[PDB]
Amino acid sequence: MKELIYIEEPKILFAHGQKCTDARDGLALFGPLNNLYGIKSGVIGTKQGLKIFRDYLDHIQKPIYNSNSITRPMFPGFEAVFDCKWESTGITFKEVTNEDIGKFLYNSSTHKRTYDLVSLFIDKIISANKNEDENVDVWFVIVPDEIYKYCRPNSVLPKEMVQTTYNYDAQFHDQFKARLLKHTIPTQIFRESTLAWRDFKNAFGLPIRDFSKIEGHLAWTISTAAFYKAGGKPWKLSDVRNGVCYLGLVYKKVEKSKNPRNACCAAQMFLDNGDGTVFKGEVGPWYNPKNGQYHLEPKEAKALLSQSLQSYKEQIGEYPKEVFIHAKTRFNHQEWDAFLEVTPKETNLVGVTISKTKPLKLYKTEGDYTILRGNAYVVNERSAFLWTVGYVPKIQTALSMEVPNPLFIEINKGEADIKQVLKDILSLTKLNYNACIFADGEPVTLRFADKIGEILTASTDIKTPPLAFKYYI
Amino acid sequence: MRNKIFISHATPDDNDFTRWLALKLIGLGYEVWCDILFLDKGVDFWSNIEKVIREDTCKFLLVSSSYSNQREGVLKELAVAAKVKKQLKDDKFIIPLAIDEQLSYDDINIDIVRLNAIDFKMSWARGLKDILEAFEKQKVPKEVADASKSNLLYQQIFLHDKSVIEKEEIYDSNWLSILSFPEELRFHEYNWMLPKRFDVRELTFPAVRYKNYLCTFAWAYDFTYHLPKTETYHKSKTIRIPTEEILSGSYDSNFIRNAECKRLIVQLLNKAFELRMKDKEVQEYEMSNKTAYWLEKGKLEKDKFEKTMLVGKQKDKNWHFAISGASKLYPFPVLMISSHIFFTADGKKLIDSSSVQHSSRRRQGKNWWNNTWRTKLLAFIKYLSDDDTSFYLEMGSEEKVFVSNEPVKFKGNVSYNI
RNA sequence: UUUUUUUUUUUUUUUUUU
DNA sequence: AAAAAAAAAAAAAAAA
After folding, report:
1. A294 among the known binding-site residues?
2. For residue B186, what is the enclosing H or E element?
3. Quick one: which residues bind Mg(2+) 1 (chain A) (predicted)?
4. CB-based contact B159:A25 (threshold 8 Å)
5. Contact residues for B132 (Cβ-Cβ < 8 A; gap 6+)
6. Closest to B370 (Cβ–Cβ): which among A18, A368, A396?
């Protein structure tokens, strides 16, 4: 019989200085932190596809009700929660004809098909940005489903459907968000099925993407993402101590260049003078030769840590007192030695390795519910387990579906207090602006770093990418 | 009838909180009067407020803050409310609300110091919960109105019913404790007696080829059947190590390092586990990285060991519970076990389509909850048992590794309830 | 790609040993 | 060409 500690649930700050562990409840009662007067949404897609977007925006104007409100809070309407005008009136529409899609879509080569489809949308979006008077905060790309079916790797166009550049990714979404980076245009790619799904029909008659029970949560996740992409701050962390920078390093392969080249990208959060949080990516992608190195050479590690420390000093005035570098990979001494010259004497540099690989599964004795979320097993002063995914009473159910697995948090380098390290990762898991859920199973630095890397390893000609998450998620 | 909730407050300064509170109370079906949103334009405001407090005010809510203590209008409305409190004979008429942390309880206006206040300083949601509970207890009339929006809002505010409670709880893991190890890890230098082009994996007891030494916990002449050249081996050529020192990590030298000596123990333990599963006659499904062992149909009675079924029937697809294990020595000496489901169309032949197996596994696991996995896991492990407390791994003719069939139990100080 | 989660089918690198 | 301990890429399903 071994000890199993519990960490207090992290709270996130809302309007009026009010705090709440949940995000849906926090917005439903107090609203967002900042006020956006309105969202001018530009829509690019078919005439048929604009109807579904108009219908769904009109839908989310009214309150939305799900079957079981205790697990998922009901959606009270966009203006009710965000105090922001998001009307179907004033949507700048760009015409993407079905014939134009069919000209490119019906191609045997996946790569050229993806490139042509993405070019079709991006050219119109750029022309609208440059050559029109209307101002668009966020550009919703309503995309069909056959394109989704046949514009991603390992998709085989049927031979009966065949009618008729490789330096880019074969995936539509990644390449799309990659090529728009030099223009800094916030976008939101929507499938037509993810929108008003009920008209999508299968053989048996039931809807394929049945969201009837989960209408409220779908509206919650769409509204929060749209509000974030328009420049709104839905919530903010309250438990973060002053003088701490975090950083999250994730290594992504690059196929276009010979050898995977192991691009490394980082997501950074620290605090600002005051109380505001500064959650921006810190990506200068530092490419790493060798097939499976996943480890940074001293020059590139020096560049990464320097750029991270300057992005802190130029925003606060002084150096961080303690950096807590999170990573999915285990550091060897080569990067740490290179890091230590860059860090001055005052700074305390800490490296943390987080993993899902460890097969530990805590089943409780009786009752068809899983372990409480927040439980942690501290193996020793340097390593620990944390059940970030599990049962939490407020949402009335487990965040997982089957029995989950904890996060193997190991302080690979530096000293750090293990309890304090586990006190921050649990707080990290609450800043997911791409989704309005109770909490995420992985710390947001390693997640948004993963996204910002999956976007920047799709384009060959990207130079000095933007550091805002608006352009990435 | 008096069915209004007057909210006196600082109207230029305390405007935002008062607006939010009034809106929330209206959304709950509570009729509310307040100057900022209910006072009519172009009217004698004092006469209207007089009428509201004297005649229609069911309950009086005084928003107390640093500004609200000593400015004239708030005091005037409070005095009128006190007169109405005397007239109605209702000691609970005035319910002051404190939203200012800086507002010390010593310097509050005496007329409301005597009264009890509802705490809004730390959170505006616990205060709302307290107000609602007091109003339900004190029986303030509410017109139900929406009856769905209002009820679900009441659920959303009362968020409070579900929190962590302090209570010790027992949890069962999937870590099968390794109870004992053989005394010595032996490196027999068979050298030329061991064929260089031979498969050490085919040896009965588990043995790893390291340099020219054979890594095994077994006896020197225990491999004579597969190696006839080793019959003339000399036992003085062994470099046996005190296994406990390897587990501690104390032993380290040029011959073997600590990292590379414990890595050889894990492979030995895994191979012994595999050989035991071969001994137990359980069929195996080859996975991508590990291998998992699933139990046939008809091998055990009713396909249900103890009181837990391990193989069931689903459409034309028989589902089988299977486990895969791996030894790890970093945290503890343990044998981690992971659960899996594999499907057979006839009960003897596995389905060759990986996609079909994945889909069927998802279909069967959509509804397998905590005790729907734990009970099967403990049933399978108990079925692998040789005695009442553990089962042994055949690693030597005289050396055995006893792994318990009772997983390491965990204990948390906090819990919850249905 | 509204999501999140749990799986699985791949494939790799490093360490040392031959 | 083995092993164990550490790695990312990708499709599939179910519920959030």
Report:
1. no
2. strand B184-188
3. 434
4. yes
5. B28, B154, B157, B158
6. A368
Q: Rounded to whole angstroms, how far apart are CA atoms B376 and B304?
A: 10
Contact A118, A459 (CB under 8 A): no
Contact across the interface for A69 and B152, Cβ inside 8 Å? yes
d(CA A325, CA B114): 54
> How far off is chain A from B387, nearest CA to CA, in Å?
22
CA neighbours within 13 Å on the CB side: how many for B213?
A: 17
Q: Do residues B96 and B105 lie in contact, with contact meaning Cβ atoms separated by under 8 Å? A: no
**Scanning every residue of chain A, which has its alpha carbon at the shortest distance from the alpha carbon of B127?**
A18
Contact A16 B16 (CB under 8 A): yes
Q: Show residues of chain B in contact with A391, CB under 8 Å.
A: 416
* CB-count burial class (<10 Å; 0-12, 13-18, 19+) for A406: buried
What residue in B sits closest to A382 (Cα-Cα)? B331
Q: How far is CA A180 from CA A122, A129, A174, in A?
A: 7, 11, 10
* N residues, chain B: 418
Resolution of the entry in angstroms: 3.2
Q: Does A393 sit within 8 Å of B163, measured CB to CB? A: yes
Residue B28 C-alpha, separation from nearest chain A C-alpha, in angstroms: 13
How many other CB atoms are found less than 10 A from the CB of residue B140?
19
Using CA atoms, how far apart are residues B224 and B412, in angstroms rounded to an integer? 51
Chain-centre distance for alpha carbon A179: 18
Spell out which residues of chain A touch residue B173, defining contact as CB-CB under 8 Å: 360-363
- Partner-chain contact B174 A363, CB within 8 Å: yes
Two tokens, residue A33: 């932190």
Method: cryo-EM
In this complex, the nucleotide whose C1' atom is nearest to the CA atom of residue A330 is: D6
